[PDB]
């Protein structure tokens, strides 16, 4: 009742929450998904990485991917045409810290990258 009315654009606080929920661990791992770091397709790539990373440690039990799926519902980035596997990290949290920063580093609050105007249709 004290949340968004139905469907608009209130997924910014959900990203800030994940940022505060995933700290900055660094026991002995790497950065995050290299091939999944795509500029505009990263959101789908991170979602697929989180599902497979839950196999390295039981830390994926934090059922928050659903909130990220809502973020994609609020911010347009569902480009499921680049969802492939790359490397695996030993600690989930380490990957989540880098993924949380890369998912928010996409741009700011509108589009990921700039593009050119078409001839027939207007903007996209």
From TrEMBL:
One of its GO terms (molecular function) is cytokine activity. GO terms for biological process: immune response. Disulfide bonds join 11-74. It comes from the Eukaryota. Keywords: Cytokine, Disulfide bond, Growth factor, Secreted, Signal. GO terms for cellular component: extracellular space. It is found in: Secreted. Belongs to the IL-3 family. Cytokine secreted predominantly by activated T-lymphocytes as well as mast cells and osteoblastic cells that controls the production and differentiation of hematopoietic progenitor cells into lineage-restricted cells. Stimulates also mature basophils, eosinophils, and monocytes to become functionally activated. In addition, plays an important role in neural cell proliferation and survival. Participates as well in bone homeostasis and inhibits osteoclast differentiation by preventing NF-kappa-B nuclear translocation and activation. This is Interleukin-3. The chain holds residues 33 to 156 of 166 of the full protein.
């Amino acid at each position: 009742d004290t949340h968004r009315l139905t469907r608009t654009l209130n997924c910014s606080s959900i990203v800030k929450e994940i940022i505060g929920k995933l700290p900055e661990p660094e026991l002995k791992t790497d950065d995050e998904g290299p091939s999944l770091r795509n500029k505009s397709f990263r959101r789908v790539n991170l979602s697929k990485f989180v599902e497979s990373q839950g196999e390295v440690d039981p830390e994926d039990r934090y059922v928050i991917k659903s909130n990220l799926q809502k973020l994609n519902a609020c911010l347009p980035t569902s480009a499921n045409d680049s969802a492939l596997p790359g490397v695996f990290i030993r600690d989930l949290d380490d990957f989540r810290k880098k993924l949380r920063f890369y998912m928010v580093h996409l741009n700011d609050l509108e589009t990921v990258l700039t593009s050119r105007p078409p001839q027939p249709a207007s903007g996209s």
